[PDB]
Design a protein around this ligand. Structure first.
Ligand code: HEM
Ligand code: HEM
Lengths: 667, 657
């Protein structure tokens, strides 16, 4: 195998950012004139360019497709992908054969971006242009929210004929369903996306393939980043090759109407081969034959439908809904508006992160909405009383720290989804997770925490009240203060109140299941279904929390000694006196009086026999990789020194503070 | 991965601030200068003698192991680009741990932790291992030259990086470390008067190879151990030979033995005396082997190679010369990659500057203030020198910096001196001999009639004229800006300049000046990436420097390759806003060359280009930065970004600041 890659933790560093450090995305994209931007984009779509002549004299459909391909790489498994930082500029995404001829679109949008510059990120534009194109044709969309930041280096990572080159509609139905289920799109949403997105535009296959050149990443230097140069005929325009199929779906390819489902359910479809050798479907009995317009103004075309678009006619659970839409268009417009809004905004986070004047004024359950604050927040003079009340409630530091971490470690920095906001660790999909230990001391902790707000709120000075979501994090901070005060350090953990409490109706139990950690390395948990070893999954978890190598190291080192790991297992607790935040985990695995040997009862744990032969410690794979990996052993030796205890405690407090406030986008 | 030989921009942010646990307000220079060094030597000495069970010491002394570890840490220096050596952050990280001849050094860095844990953040790992070697050397009868702390350690591996048949091999190996014949002879002889190799077992296969490589696949539980099936106590690492009869003391015994008896027999790997053995040497635990079954791998070339044997046979009866020469050679070896003498800290550093450090005279006059700088700036702007001449001269003097080993830079004033004034890239047939002449006249006229004891040095004038140029160009573009200038450089002389040691600093290909010499391994773009990595420039600083130097007239030989502007010698972002111009169609020039030409303004040619200054519009990750600086509102930000990058690269070698 290959050694673990610590460069994944410090991805997208500051030195690669041309905008500097004093740059605020929201503070500027909240100031543009969206009407002016709409005018600029609308005059970019309708003016043809000789480098890529526009079909029908409208670049709209190209921009809709670019917006779909930008946001169509989201994965609910891991969260990475989607619009996000707009990675279809750098990554393999710009060189995939699936993304053919989308470099041209991003090139055509340069005149818009040139005018605005730093106050309009690429990620917005390639997702806004499409959303404007979809509205330029007469489909009143649902709303748009700017605010997805631009990034400066790539990351780590369905056939038009259906299966692997086999034209079959019923067989492509399951492929479409499975590839759209990874985006978390039910049958209605995926049918609406396929029907709506194909009422516009055409397919580009006018010439035989094998004449196009290489992708942008392996293209000649003089093409300026535009791969897939075609040598067929003129090369571009009427002779453009992008996927090798020549399908034009509707007779109105630059206007929204119910002309897709009427063609699909109107003719009988028979199989035929594209001019470039691809499989497609054409109307049987020569029906049509000169009804669909030609982009450059030549002779008309017989009706033609792709191999996967016919699925919506043979799959019963697609056929039912699409036939209903054929009898009811306004439902199709509604479903497509909502599905498109979900598609381009799925990996963007809480509602408090959308910007601009187009953002809708309603809560959609797929956003995991949390209520707005209905009272003045708890003041600093009053979090002291509440902190003391928590510290004198009989709850051990282990229980409080474990509960606070369990609440606030379900965050996905890739998806901005999860976190401690909303107070969902009390709710059904999350109180029952195995790592959280629904048994034991989570119901007890939650009860003794919500019997504290029940007393504080009733006997409160004015309108000031505290929410449960704040109470779990405040208990974590109180426990850390109590622990550090036992190691001799008098510190205060920073705490910014404001979290609210989400009821059960606003929590989608089905949605909050991919958030479940199959392996949380900080709590020393390793469930089944893990693809990689333990240390790699800890590294992945740390990357998701947007943690760096020093923060991850100090966090695990302090979190073992604080006693917040799975089932209170004594794995990696390298301290004699627990319930105290000290330096002991680092200074005890650098000890060379201890010889680490795998446990004879093979279960993936190691036991470090002392000098005299007695077993002193008992680590695990996650714990011992810090003493083994050279570039993590380098970091352990920083906190394992003799003078670096106060530095360690302040670094742990900083990392804990960073983790608790990951989800706080409202402040 | 899927795109091998793609432009790897990840090299420009090596060792970021994210991965540094010490923070940003941590300066190692002010930390290590406060440690007690006598306490450090006492701690190291108590570590060396006190053997530990997991790696027992030969003769009860870890000295020779620490000497060997310090040699191997500092023995990877490459004169080609300076990378390697004991610069901190190499020997303890992924490539150099698992490494066939770094055998026992994995359990020789963890042997010093009882000291690093005592001192912690105020003593780096590189400083610790090299100083451990030096103190081990000094605790076994030898008196070294000196020592200087300051090797700040990095937190990330660098993505970059029998009879006489052995004489030429070791000669080449030590020649590509910048070591001449006397220094390499002294280094080998001195280093092999200390210790043995180790014991031996059946073979390297059945022994130190249970997936034995510390980081690749050693396995957890054995965090660093070339484990052996033999015992690893007294016999280890699978090669047995001891050179001198006193392996823990400096005296003339290596080459008294070597010149004592013949070695025609090779046992199993050089025997002794052709069956004249005995008990001259001493073993580690007890017993005693033959009379020096020594001279490993037939590296007695010091007695066979005709030019080694001369100096070596001289050292047979003149041990003082060997002592002194080994002192100087060792001091050079462990301090080669550390830079100017202003960078050495601590109380051990000797007050004697050698010619290999590129010495620069210390300041004797008073530095120019904020009024004399303005007066000189005006005097040098109104002096008949164009912006292109001033900018290309200032960039020529300060782009000769090798950030890997901090050698070169604008300080020293050596562009007026022979090794640099005659380089092809510093086009001497052009204006260099004229620009330096008029700047010399300026300084003579200035400090001849100076106010008080304030004087200006030539090394200051080249840089100041560089700043007085881009100020004029920016003012001729609507943006009046002030370029920071820190006086303090002093100018060297040809006596302190090593002509044959600066040949390695010659730019084989400079991308910012659009130079490309014959004999380039990689294309013109990867050479630019290497150049900017050597200058310690991020990616945006690369981009802004290239786009400024193009339009600002700094091209090699004033070639109009990449001047995508019509306003001559003015600081604008016309390079970016015209490189992204999609109205022109690039194509290789009909001359079978590496130059392009973007025609189709209408149907005519304009804006000749090249691979260096056209990959910016091609590479997506660089296309992003160009689109940042080529926007409509980016005109005033590009000016200040260029000024910041220019200031960074001019003050790049300023360690005396
Ligand atoms: C199973 C699902 C889908 C398949 C197999 C599919 C496949 C394709 C293919 C092969 C093309 C031709 C590309 C070209 O010729 O340049 C195309 C074009 C297009 N697709 Fe899709 N697509 C799917 C879903 C979607 C979705 C969800 C949307 C929008 C939300 C969409 C919008 C478009 C548009 C507007 C075009 C026209 C592009 C142009 O005119 O250049 N498609 N699709
Ligand atoms: C062509 C030049 C050299 C060659 C081929 C060479 C080779 C070797 C080899 C094979 C070993 C055995 C290591 C072991 O058994 O663990 C060794 C050890 C050693 N080397 Fe060198 N070496 C060279 C130059 C030097 C230099 C320049 C120094 C400078 C200090 C040095 C210092 C040492 C010392 C002190 C040891 C003893 C290691 C111990 O006691 O564990 N050698 N060398």
């Amino acid at each position: 195998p290959n050694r673990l890659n610590l460069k994944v933790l410090h991805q997208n560093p500051a030195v690669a950012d041309p905008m500097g450090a004093a740059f605020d995305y929201a503070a500027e994209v909240a100031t543009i004139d969206v009407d002016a931007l709409t005018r600029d984009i609308e005059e970019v779509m309708t003016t043809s360019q000789p480098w890529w002549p526009a079909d029908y004299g409208h670049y709209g459909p190209l921009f809709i497709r670019m917006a779909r391909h930008a946001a169509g790489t989201y994965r609910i498994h891991d969260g990475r992908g989607g619009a996000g930082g707009g990675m279809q500029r750098f990554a393999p995404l710009n060189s995939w054969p699936d993304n053919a001829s989308l470099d041209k679109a991003r090139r055509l949008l340069w005149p818009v971006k040139k005018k605005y510059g730093k106050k309009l990120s690429w990620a917005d534009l390639i997702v806004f242009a499409g959303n404007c194109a979809l509205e330029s044709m007469g489909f009143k969309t649902f709303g748009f929210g700017f605010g997805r930041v631009d990034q400066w280096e790539p990351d780590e990572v369905v056939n038009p004929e259906g299966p692997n080159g086999n034209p079959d509609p019923m067989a492509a139905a399951v492929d479409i369903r499975e590839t759209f289920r990874r985006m978390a799109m039910n049958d209605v949403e995926t049918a609406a996306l396929i029907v709506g997105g194909h009422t516009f535009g055409k397919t580009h296959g006018a010439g035989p393939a094998d004449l196009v050149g290489p992708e942008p990443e392996a293209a000649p230097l003089e093409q300026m980043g535009l791969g897939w140069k075609s040598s067929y005929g003129t090369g571009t325009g009427k002779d453009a090759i992008t996927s090798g199929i020549e399908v034009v779906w509707t007779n109105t390819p630059t206007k929204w109407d119910n002309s897709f489902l009427e063609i699909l359910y109107g003719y009988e479809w028979e199989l035929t081969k594209s001019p470039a050798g691809a499989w497609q479907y054409t109307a049987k009995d020569g029906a049509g034959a000169g009804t669909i317009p030609d982009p450059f103004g030549g002779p008309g075309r017989s009706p033609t439908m792709l191999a996967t678009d016919l699925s919506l006619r043979v799959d019963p659970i697609y056929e039912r809904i699409t036939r209903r839409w054929l009898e009811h268009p306004e439902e199709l417009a509604d479903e497509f508006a909502k599905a498109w809004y979900k598609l381009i905004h799925r990996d963007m986070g809480p509602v408090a992160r959308y910007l601009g004047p187009l953002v809708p004024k309603q809560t959609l359950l797929w956003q995991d909405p949390v209520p707005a604050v209905s009272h003045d927040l708890v003041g600093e003079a009053e979090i002291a009383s509440l902190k003391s009340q928590i510290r004198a409630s009989g709850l051990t530091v282990s229980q409080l720290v474990s509960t606070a971490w369990a609440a606030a470690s379900s965050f996905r920095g890739s998806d901005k989804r999860g976190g401690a906001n909303g107070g969902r660790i009390r709710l059904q999909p999350q109180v029952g997770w195995e790592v959280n230990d629904p048994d034991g001391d989570l119901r007890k902790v939650i009860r003794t925490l919500e019997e504290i707000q029940e007393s504080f709120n009733s006997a409160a000075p004015g309108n000031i009240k505290v929410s449960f979501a704040d109470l779990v994090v405040l208990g974590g901070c109180a426990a850390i203060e109590k622990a550090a005060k036992a190691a001799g350090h008098n510190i205060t953990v920073p705490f910014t109140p404001g979290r609210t409490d989400a009821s059960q109706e606003q929590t989608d139990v089905e949605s909050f299941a991919v958030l479940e950690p199959k392996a949380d390395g900080f709590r020393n948990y390793l469930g089944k279904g893990n693809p990689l070893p333990a240390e790699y999954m800890l590294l992945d978890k740390a990357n998701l929390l947007t943690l760096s190598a020093p923060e991850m190291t100090v966090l695990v080192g302090g979190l073992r000694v604080l006693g917040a790991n799975y089932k209170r297992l004594p794995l990696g607790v390298f301290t004699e006196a627990s319930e105290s935040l000290t330096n002991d985990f680092f200074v005890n695995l650098l000890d060379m009086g201890i010889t680490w040997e795998p446990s004879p009862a093979d279960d993936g744990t190691y036991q470090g026999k002392d000098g005299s032969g007695k077993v002193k410690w008992t680590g695990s794979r996650v714990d011992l990789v810090f003493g083994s990996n050279s570039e993590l052993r380098a970091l352990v030796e920083v906190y394992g020194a003799d003078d670096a205890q106060p530095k360690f405690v302040q670094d742990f407090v900083a990392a804990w503070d960073k983790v608790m406030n990951l989800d706080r986008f409202d402040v």
